[PDB]
């Protein structure tokens, strides 16, 4: 096995003999910009470029949670 | 196995003998811009380009959750 | 196996002997811009281009959930 | 197996002996802009282009869910 | 197997011996702009073009769901 | 197998011995603009074009669902 890229992700849940149970496993997935390149020969020639990435994130999420048993 | 790219994602749930159970596993998936390139020979010649990516995200989500047993 | 790209995604659910059970596994999938390129020979010649990507996302979703058992 | 692109997606549900069960697995799928290119020889020559992508998303979805057992 | 593109999607449901069961698996599919190109030789020559994509999405969907068992 | 594009989609449901069951699997399919091109030789020559795609989507769909068992 020569050059290669392997990404392993996800959820692996196993239940063998549930007599009385309640498994609650929501799976939220959000994948933003993803760039995957593969080439035998790659030759890139550039000039006075400009690459700009702007991240304005006003994340607003106050928390007042509570867990009881 | 030479050059190659493998992405592994998802959900893997197994139930073998549920007598009384309630599996709740919602699977939400959201994949934004995804660029996958493959080439034998890649030759790119550029000039004074401009690449701009603008992310204004006013995420508003207050939380008042509560879990009881 | 030479150059190649493999993407593995999805949901894999197995139930073997459900006597009394309730599997609730909604699968929501949303795939935005996806660009997949394949070429033997790729030669790109550019000039003073302009690439702009604008993401205004006023995500509004307050949460007041509660889970009971 | 030389150059090739494989995308694997979907839902895989198996039920072998349901005596009393209720599988609820809705499958919502939404695929936006998808561009797939294949070429033996690709030669692209450009000039001062302008590529613009504008994403105004006022996602409004407050949540007041509750799960009981 | 040389250059080739394979997309695998859909739903795969199997029921072998349902004695008393209720499988509810709606399959909603919505595929927007999809561009698939194939060429032996591709030569594109451009000038000061303008490509514009405008996404105004006022998604309005408050949620007040509830799941009981 | 040289260059070729394969798209696999749909629903695959199997029932082998239903004694008392109710499979509810609606299949809603909506395919918007789809462009598929094939050519031996493709030569495109352009000028200061303008390509515009406008997506005004006031999706209005509040949800008050509830699932019981």
CSV table of C-alpha atoms in Angstrom, one decimal:
chain,number,residue,atom,x,y,z
A,1,UNK,CA,0.0,0.0,0.0
A,2,UNK,CA,1.6,3.2,-1.3
A,3,UNK,CA,0.5,6.8,-1.0
A,4,UNK,CA,-3.2,7.0,0.0
A,5,UNK,CA,-5.5,9.0,2.2
A,6,UNK,CA,-8.1,7.4,4.4
A,7,UNK,CA,-10.6,9.4,6.5
A,8,UNK,CA,-12.8,7.5,9.0
A,9,UNK,CA,-15.8,9.2,10.5
A,10,UNK,CA,-19.3,8.5,11.6
A,11,UNK,CA,-21.3,6.7,14.4
A,12,UNK,CA,-21.1,3.0,15.4
A,13,UNK,CA,-23.8,1.9,17.7
A,14,UNK,CA,-24.5,-1.7,18.7
A,15,UNK,CA,-27.4,-3.1,20.8
A,16,UNK,CA,-27.4,-6.8,21.4
A,17,UNK,CA,-30.3,-7.6,23.8
A,18,UNK,CA,-32.3,-4.6,24.8
A,19,UNK,CA,-35.0,-5.7,27.3
A,20,UNK,CA,-36.1,-2.2,28.3
A,21,UNK,CA,-34.0,0.7,27.0
A,22,UNK,CA,-34.2,4.0,25.1
A,23,UNK,CA,-31.2,4.9,23.0
A,24,UNK,CA,-31.3,8.5,21.8
A,25,UNK,CA,-28.4,9.2,19.5
A,26,UNK,CA,-29.2,12.0,17.1
A,27,UNK,CA,-26.4,12.5,14.4
A,28,UNK,CA,-26.1,16.1,13.1
A,29,UNK,CA,-23.5,16.5,10.3
A,30,UNK,CA,-22.5,19.7,8.6
A,31,UNK,CA,-19.6,19.7,6.2
A,32,UNK,CA,-18.5,23.1,4.8
A,33,UNK,CA,-16.0,23.8,2.0
A,34,UNK,CA,-14.1,20.6,1.2
A,35,UNK,CA,-11.5,20.5,-1.5
A,36,UNK,CA,-9.9,17.1,-2.5
A,37,UNK,CA,-7.3,17.1,-5.2
A,38,UNK,CA,-5.5,14.2,-6.9
A,39,UNK,CA,-3.0,14.4,-9.7
A,40,UNK,CA,-0.2,12.4,-11.3
A,41,UNK,CA,1.7,15.6,-12.2
A,42,UNK,CA,0.7,19.0,-10.8
A,43,UNK,CA,2.4,22.2,-12.1
A,44,UNK,CA,0.9,25.5,-11.0
A,45,UNK,CA,2.2,28.9,-12.1
A,46,UNK,CA,0.8,32.0,-10.4
A,47,UNK,CA,1.2,35.8,-10.3
A,48,UNK,CA,0.4,38.5,-7.7
A,49,UNK,CA,-2.8,36.8,-6.7
A,50,UNK,CA,-5.1,37.6,-3.7
A,51,UNK,CA,-6.8,35.0,-1.7
A,52,UNK,CA,-9.3,36.3,0.9
A,53,UNK,CA,-11.4,34.3,3.4
A,54,UNK,CA,-13.7,36.3,5.7
A,55,UNK,CA,-15.4,34.7,8.7
A,56,UNK,CA,-17.9,37.0,10.5
A,57,UNK,CA,-19.7,34.8,13.0
A,58,UNK,CA,-22.0,36.4,15.5
A,59,UNK,CA,-22.8,33.1,17.2
A,60,UNK,CA,-25.5,33.9,19.8
A,61,UNK,CA,-26.6,31.0,22.0
A,62,UNK,CA,-27.0,31.6,25.8
A,63,UNK,CA,-27.4,28.4,27.8
A,64,UNK,CA,-29.6,27.7,30.8
A,65,UNK,CA,-29.8,23.9,30.6
A,66,UNK,CA,-30.3,21.6,33.5
A,67,UNK,CA,-30.1,17.8,33.9
A,68,UNK,CA,-31.9,15.9,36.6
A,69,UNK,CA,-32.1,12.2,37.7
B,1,UNK,CA,-2.9,0.0,-4.0
B,2,UNK,CA,-1.3,3.2,-5.3
B,3,UNK,CA,-2.5,6.8,-4.9
B,4,UNK,CA,-6.2,6.9,-3.9
B,5,UNK,CA,-8.5,8.8,-1.6
B,6,UNK,CA,-11.1,7.1,0.6
B,7,UNK,CA,-13.7,9.0,2.7
B,8,UNK,CA,-15.7,7.0,5.2
B,9,UNK,CA,-18.8,8.6,6.8
B,10,UNK,CA,-22.3,7.8,7.9
B,11,UNK,CA,-24.2,5.9,10.6
B,12,UNK,CA,-23.9,2.2,11.5
B,13,UNK,CA,-26.7,0.9,13.8
B,14,UNK,CA,-27.2,-2.7,14.8
B,15,UNK,CA,-30.1,-4.2,16.8
B,16,UNK,CA,-30.0,-8.0,17.3
B,17,UNK,CA,-32.9,-8.9,19.7
B,18,UNK,CA,-35.0,-5.9,20.8
B,19,UNK,CA,-37.6,-7.1,23.2
B,20,UNK,CA,-38.8,-3.7,24.4
B,21,UNK,CA,-36.8,-0.7,23.1
B,22,UNK,CA,-37.1,2.6,21.3
B,23,UNK,CA,-34.1,3.6,19.2
B,24,UNK,CA,-34.3,7.3,18.1
B,25,UNK,CA,-31.4,8.1,15.8
B,26,UNK,CA,-32.2,11.0,13.4
B,27,UNK,CA,-29.5,11.6,10.8
B,28,UNK,CA,-29.2,15.1,9.6
B,29,UNK,CA,-26.7,15.7,6.8
B,30,UNK,CA,-25.7,19.0,5.2
B,31,UNK,CA,-22.8,19.1,2.7
B,32,UNK,CA,-21.9,22.6,1.4
B,33,UNK,CA,-19.4,23.4,-1.4
B,34,UNK,CA,-17.4,20.3,-2.2
B,35,UNK,CA,-14.8,20.2,-5.0
B,36,UNK,CA,-13.2,17.0,-6.0
B,37,UNK,CA,-10.6,17.0,-8.8
B,38,UNK,CA,-8.7,14.2,-10.5
B,39,UNK,CA,-6.2,14.5,-13.4
B,40,UNK,CA,-3.3,12.7,-15.0
B,41,UNK,CA,-1.5,15.9,-15.8
B,42,UNK,CA,-2.6,19.3,-14.4
B,43,UNK,CA,-1.0,22.5,-15.6
B,44,UNK,CA,-2.6,25.8,-14.3
B,45,UNK,CA,-1.3,29.2,-15.4
B,46,UNK,CA,-2.8,32.3,-13.6
B,47,UNK,CA,-2.5,36.0,-13.4
B,48,UNK,CA,-3.3,38.6,-10.8
B,49,UNK,CA,-6.5,36.9,-9.8
B,50,UNK,CA,-8.8,37.6,-6.8
B,51,UNK,CA,-10.5,34.8,-4.8
B,52,UNK,CA,-12.9,36.0,-2.2
B,53,UNK,CA,-15.0,33.9,0.3
B,54,UNK,CA,-17.4,35.8,2.6
B,55,UNK,CA,-19.0,34.2,5.6
B,56,UNK,CA,-21.5,36.3,7.4
B,57,UNK,CA,-23.3,34.0,9.9
B,58,UNK,CA,-25.6,35.5,12.5
B,59,UNK,CA,-26.3,32.2,14.1
B,60,UNK,CA,-29.0,32.9,16.7
B,61,UNK,CA,-30.0,29.9,18.9
B,62,UNK,CA,-30.5,30.4,22.6
B,63,UNK,CA,-30.8,27.1,24.5
B,64,UNK,CA,-33.0,26.3,27.5
B,65,UNK,CA,-33.0,22.5,27.3
B,66,UNK,CA,-33.5,20.1,30.1
B,67,UNK,CA,-33.2,16.3,30.4
B,68,UNK,CA,-35.0,14.2,33.1
B,69,UNK,CA,-35.0,10.6,34.0
C,1,UNK,CA,-5.7,0.0,-7.9
C,2,UNK,CA,-4.2,3.3,-9.1
C,3,UNK,CA,-5.5,6.9,-8.6
C,4,UNK,CA,-9.2,6.9,-7.6
C,5,UNK,CA,-11.5,8.7,-5.2
C,6,UNK,CA,-14.1,6.9,-3.1
C,7,UNK,CA,-16.7,8.6,-0.9
C,8,UNK,CA,-18.7,6.5,1.5
C,9,UNK,CA,-21.8,8.0,3.1
C,10,UNK,CA,-25.2,7.1,4.3
C,11,UNK,CA,-27.1,5.1,6.9
C,12,UNK,CA,-26.8,1.4,7.7
C,13,UNK,CA,-29.4,0.0,10.1
C,14,UNK,CA,-29.9,-3.7,10.9
C,15,UNK,CA,-32.7,-5.3,12.9
C,16,UNK,CA,-32.6,-9.0,13.4
C,17,UNK,CA,-35.4,-10.1,15.7
C,18,UNK,CA,-37.5,-7.2,16.9
C,19,UNK,CA,-40.2,-8.5,19.3
C,20,UNK,CA,-41.4,-5.1,20.5
C,21,UNK,CA,-39.5,-2.1,19.3
C,22,UNK,CA,-39.8,1.3,17.6
C,23,UNK,CA,-36.9,2.4,15.5
C,24,UNK,CA,-37.2,6.1,14.5
C,25,UNK,CA,-34.3,7.0,12.2
C,26,UNK,CA,-35.2,9.9,9.9
C,27,UNK,CA,-32.5,10.6,7.3
C,28,UNK,CA,-32.4,14.2,6.1
C,29,UNK,CA,-29.8,14.9,3.3
C,30,UNK,CA,-29.0,18.3,1.8
C,31,UNK,CA,-26.1,18.5,-0.7
C,32,UNK,CA,-25.2,22.0,-1.9
C,33,UNK,CA,-22.8,23.0,-4.7
C,34,UNK,CA,-20.7,19.9,-5.6
C,35,UNK,CA,-18.1,20.0,-8.4
C,36,UNK,CA,-16.4,16.8,-9.5
C,37,UNK,CA,-13.8,16.9,-12.3
C,38,UNK,CA,-11.9,14.2,-14.1
C,39,UNK,CA,-9.4,14.7,-16.9
C,40,UNK,CA,-6.5,12.9,-18.6
C,41,UNK,CA,-4.8,16.2,-19.4
C,42,UNK,CA,-5.9,19.5,-17.8
C,43,UNK,CA,-4.4,22.8,-19.0
C,44,UNK,CA,-6.1,26.0,-17.7
C,45,UNK,CA,-4.9,29.5,-18.6
C,46,UNK,CA,-6.4,32.5,-16.8
C,47,UNK,CA,-6.2,36.2,-16.5
C,48,UNK,CA,-7.1,38.8,-13.8
C,49,UNK,CA,-10.3,36.9,-12.9
C,50,UNK,CA,-12.5,37.5,-9.9
C,51,UNK,CA,-14.1,34.7,-7.9
C,52,UNK,CA,-16.6,35.7,-5.3
C,53,UNK,CA,-18.6,33.6,-2.9
C,54,UNK,CA,-21.0,35.4,-0.5
C,55,UNK,CA,-22.6,33.6,2.5
C,56,UNK,CA,-25.2,35.6,4.4
C,57,UNK,CA,-26.8,33.2,6.8
C,58,UNK,CA,-29.2,34.7,9.4
C,59,UNK,CA,-29.8,31.2,11.0
C,60,UNK,CA,-32.5,31.8,13.6
C,61,UNK,CA,-33.5,28.8,15.7
C,62,UNK,CA,-33.9,29.1,19.5
C,63,UNK,CA,-34.2,25.8,21.3
C,64,UNK,CA,-36.3,24.9,24.3
C,65,UNK,CA,-36.3,21.1,24.0
C,66,UNK,CA,-36.7,18.6,26.8
C,67,UNK,CA,-36.3,14.8,26.9
C,68,UNK,CA,-38.0,12.7,29.6
C,69,UNK,CA,-37.9,9.0,30.5
D,1,UNK,CA,-8.6,-0.1,-11.7
D,2,UNK,CA,-7.2,3.3,-12.9
D,3,UNK,CA,-8.6,6.8,-12.3
D,4,UNK,CA,-12.2,6.7,-11.3
D,5,UNK,CA,-14.6,8.4,-8.9
D,6,UNK,CA,-17.1,6.5,-6.7
D,7,UNK,CA,-19.8,8.2,-4.6
D,8,UNK,CA,-21.7,6.0,-2.2
D,9,UNK,CA,-24.8,7.4,-0.5
D,10,UNK,CA,-28.3,6.4,0.6
D,11,UNK,CA,-30.1,4.3,3.3
D,12,UNK,CA,-29.7,0.6,4.0
D,13,UNK,CA,-32.3,-0.9,6.3
D,14,UNK,CA,-32.7,-4.6,7.1
D,15,UNK,CA,-35.5,-6.3,9.0
D,16,UNK,CA,-35.3,-10.1,9.4
D,17,UNK,CA,-38.0,-11.2,11.8
D,18,UNK,CA,-40.2,-8.4,13.0
D,19,UNK,CA,-42.8,-9.8,15.4
D,20,UNK,CA,-44.1,-6.4,16.7
D,21,UNK,CA,-42.2,-3.4,15.5
D,22,UNK,CA,-42.7,0.0,13.9
D,23,UNK,CA,-39.8,1.3,11.8
D,24,UNK,CA,-40.1,4.9,10.9
D,25,UNK,CA,-37.3,6.0,8.6
D,26,UNK,CA,-38.3,8.9,6.3
D,27,UNK,CA,-35.6,9.7,3.7
D,28,UNK,CA,-35.5,13.4,2.6
D,29,UNK,CA,-33.0,14.1,-0.1
D,30,UNK,CA,-32.2,17.5,-1.6
D,31,UNK,CA,-29.3,17.9,-4.1
D,32,UNK,CA,-28.5,21.4,-5.3
D,33,UNK,CA,-26.1,22.5,-8.0
D,34,UNK,CA,-24.0,19.5,-9.0
D,35,UNK,CA,-21.4,19.7,-11.8
D,36,UNK,CA,-19.7,16.5,-13.0
D,37,UNK,CA,-17.1,16.8,-15.7
D,38,UNK,CA,-15.1,14.1,-17.6
D,39,UNK,CA,-12.7,14.7,-20.4
D,40,UNK,CA,-9.7,13.1,-22.1
D,41,UNK,CA,-8.1,16.4,-22.9
D,42,UNK,CA,-9.3,19.6,-21.3
D,43,UNK,CA,-7.8,23.0,-22.4
D,44,UNK,CA,-9.5,26.1,-21.0
D,45,UNK,CA,-8.4,29.6,-21.8
D,46,UNK,CA,-10.0,32.5,-20.0
D,47,UNK,CA,-9.8,36.3,-19.6
D,48,UNK,CA,-10.8,38.8,-16.9
D,49,UNK,CA,-13.9,36.8,-15.9
D,50,UNK,CA,-16.2,37.3,-12.9
D,51,UNK,CA,-17.7,34.4,-11.0
D,52,UNK,CA,-20.2,35.4,-8.3
D,53,UNK,CA,-22.2,33.1,-6.0
D,54,UNK,CA,-24.6,34.8,-3.5
D,55,UNK,CA,-26.1,32.9,-0.6
D,56,UNK,CA,-28.7,34.9,1.3
D,57,UNK,CA,-30.3,32.4,3.7
D,58,UNK,CA,-32.7,33.8,6.4
D,59,UNK,CA,-33.3,30.3,7.9
D,60,UNK,CA,-36.0,30.8,10.5
D,61,UNK,CA,-36.9,27.7,12.5
D,62,UNK,CA,-37.3,27.9,16.3
D,63,UNK,CA,-37.5,24.6,18.1
D,64,UNK,CA,-39.6,23.6,21.1
D,65,UNK,CA,-39.5,19.8,20.7
D,66,UNK,CA,-39.8,17.2,23.4
D,67,UNK,CA,-39.3,13.4,23.5
D,68,UNK,CA,-41.0,11.2,26.1
D,69,UNK,CA,-40.9,7.5,26.9
E,1,UNK,CA,-11.4,0.1,-15.6
E,2,UNK,CA,-10.1,3.5,-16.7
E,3,UNK,CA,-11.6,7.0,-16.0
E,4,UNK,CA,-15.2,6.8,-15.0
E,5,UNK,CA,-17.6,8.4,-12.6
E,6,UNK,CA,-20.1,6.4,-10.5
E,7,UNK,CA,-22.8,7.9,-8.3
E,8,UNK,CA,-24.6,5.6,-5.9
E,9,UNK,CA,-27.8,6.9,-4.2
E,10,UNK,CA,-31.2,5.8,-3.1
E,11,UNK,CA,-33.0,3.6,-0.5
E,12,UNK,CA,-32.4,-0.1,0.1
E,13,UNK,CA,-35.0,-1.7,2.4
E,14,UNK,CA,-35.3,-5.4,3.1
E,15,UNK,CA,-38.1,-7.3,5.0
E,16,UNK,CA,-37.7,-11.0,5.3
E,17,UNK,CA,-40.5,-12.3,7.7
E,18,UNK,CA,-42.8,-9.5,9.0
E,19,UNK,CA,-45.3,-11.1,11.3
E,20,UNK,CA,-46.7,-7.8,12.7
E,21,UNK,CA,-44.9,-4.6,11.6
E,22,UNK,CA,-45.4,-1.2,10.0
E,23,UNK,CA,-42.5,0.1,7.9
E,24,UNK,CA,-43.0,3.8,7.1
E,25,UNK,CA,-40.2,5.0,4.8
E,26,UNK,CA,-41.3,7.9,2.7
E,27,UNK,CA,-38.6,8.9,0.1
E,28,UNK,CA,-38.6,12.5,-0.9
E,29,UNK,CA,-36.1,13.4,-3.7
E,30,UNK,CA,-35.4,16.9,-5.1
E,31,UNK,CA,-32.6,17.4,-7.6
E,32,UNK,CA,-31.9,20.9,-8.7
E,33,UNK,CA,-29.5,22.1,-11.4
E,34,UNK,CA,-27.3,19.2,-12.5
E,35,UNK,CA,-24.7,19.5,-15.2
E,36,UNK,CA,-22.9,16.4,-16.5
E,37,UNK,CA,-20.3,16.8,-19.3
E,38,UNK,CA,-18.3,14.3,-21.2
E,39,UNK,CA,-15.9,14.9,-24.0
E,40,UNK,CA,-12.9,13.4,-25.8
E,41,UNK,CA,-11.3,16.8,-26.4
E,42,UNK,CA,-12.6,20.0,-24.7
E,43,UNK,CA,-11.3,23.4,-25.8
E,44,UNK,CA,-13.0,26.4,-24.3
E,45,UNK,CA,-12.0,30.0,-25.1
E,46,UNK,CA,-13.7,32.8,-23.2
E,47,UNK,CA,-13.6,36.6,-22.7
E,48,UNK,CA,-14.6,39.0,-19.9
E,49,UNK,CA,-17.7,36.9,-19.0
E,50,UNK,CA,-19.9,37.3,-16.0
E,51,UNK,CA,-21.4,34.3,-14.2
E,52,UNK,CA,-23.9,35.2,-11.4
E,53,UNK,CA,-25.8,32.8,-9.1
E,54,UNK,CA,-28.3,34.4,-6.7
E,55,UNK,CA,-29.8,32.4,-3.8
E,56,UNK,CA,-32.4,34.3,-1.8
E,57,UNK,CA,-33.9,31.7,0.5
E,58,UNK,CA,-36.3,32.9,3.2
E,59,UNK,CA,-36.8,29.4,4.6
E,60,UNK,CA,-39.5,29.7,7.3
E,61,UNK,CA,-40.3,26.6,9.3
E,62,UNK,CA,-40.8,26.8,13.0
E,63,UNK,CA,-40.9,23.4,14.7
E,64,UNK,CA,-42.9,22.2,17.7
E,65,UNK,CA,-42.7,18.5,17.2
E,66,UNK,CA,-43.0,15.8,19.9
E,67,UNK,CA,-42.4,12.1,19.9
E,68,UNK,CA,-44.1,9.8,22.5
E,69,UNK,CA,-43.8,6.1,23.2
F,1,UNK,CA,-14.4,0.1,-19.6
F,2,UNK,CA,-13.1,3.5,-20.6
F,3,UNK,CA,-14.7,6.9,-19.8
F,4,UNK,CA,-18.3,6.6,-18.8
F,5,UNK,CA,-20.7,8.2,-16.3
F,6,UNK,CA,-23.1,6.1,-14.3
F,7,UNK,CA,-25.8,7.5,-12.0
F,8,UNK,CA,-27.7,5.1,-9.7
F,9,UNK,CA,-30.8,6.3,-7.9
F,10,UNK,CA,-34.2,5.1,-6.8
F,11,UNK,CA,-35.9,2.8,-4.3
F,12,UNK,CA,-35.3,-0.9,-3.7
F,13,UNK,CA,-37.9,-2.6,-1.5
F,14,UNK,CA,-38.1,-6.3,-0.9
F,15,UNK,CA,-40.8,-8.3,1.1
F,16,UNK,CA,-40.4,-12.0,1.3
F,17,UNK,CA,-43.1,-13.4,3.6
F,18,UNK,CA,-45.4,-10.7,5.0
F,19,UNK,CA,-47.9,-12.3,7.3
F,20,UNK,CA,-49.3,-9.1,8.7
F,21,UNK,CA,-47.6,-5.9,7.7
F,22,UNK,CA,-48.2,-2.5,6.2
F,23,UNK,CA,-45.4,-1.0,4.1
F,24,UNK,CA,-45.9,2.7,3.4
F,25,UNK,CA,-43.1,3.9,1.1
F,26,UNK,CA,-44.3,6.9,-1.0
F,27,UNK,CA,-41.7,8.0,-3.5
F,28,UNK,CA,-41.7,11.6,-4.5
F,29,UNK,CA,-39.3,12.6,-7.2
F,30,UNK,CA,-38.7,16.1,-8.6
F,31,UNK,CA,-35.8,16.8,-11.0
F,32,UNK,CA,-35.2,20.4,-12.1
F,33,UNK,CA,-32.9,21.6,-14.8
F,34,UNK,CA,-30.7,18.8,-15.9
F,35,UNK,CA,-28.1,19.2,-18.7
F,36,UNK,CA,-26.2,16.2,-20.0
F,37,UNK,CA,-23.6,16.7,-22.8
F,38,UNK,CA,-21.6,14.2,-24.8
F,39,UNK,CA,-19.2,15.0,-27.6
F,40,UNK,CA,-16.2,13.6,-29.4
F,41,UNK,CA,-14.7,17.0,-30.0
F,42,UNK,CA,-16.0,20.1,-28.3
F,43,UNK,CA,-14.7,23.6,-29.2
F,44,UNK,CA,-16.6,26.6,-27.7
F,45,UNK,CA,-15.6,30.2,-28.4
F,46,UNK,CA,-17.3,32.9,-26.4
F,47,UNK,CA,-17.3,36.7,-25.9
F,48,UNK,CA,-18.3,39.0,-23.0
F,49,UNK,CA,-21.4,36.9,-22.1
F,50,UNK,CA,-23.6,37.1,-19.1
F,51,UNK,CA,-25.0,34.0,-17.3
F,52,UNK,CA,-27.5,34.8,-14.6
F,53,UNK,CA,-29.4,32.3,-12.3
F,54,UNK,CA,-31.8,33.8,-9.8
F,55,UNK,CA,-33.3,31.8,-6.9
F,56,UNK,CA,-36.0,33.5,-4.9
F,57,UNK,CA,-37.4,30.8,-2.6
F,58,UNK,CA,-39.8,32.0,0.1
F,59,UNK,CA,-40.2,28.4,1.5
F,60,UNK,CA,-42.9,28.6,4.1
F,61,UNK,CA,-43.7,25.4,6.0
F,62,UNK,CA,-44.1,25.5,9.8
F,63,UNK,CA,-44.1,22.1,11.5
F,64,UNK,CA,-46.1,20.9,14.4
F,65,UNK,CA,-45.8,17.1,13.8
F,66,UNK,CA,-46.1,14.4,16.5
F,67,UNK,CA,-45.4,10.7,16.4
F,68,UNK,CA,-47.0,8.3,18.9
F,69,UNK,CA,-46.7,4.5,19.6
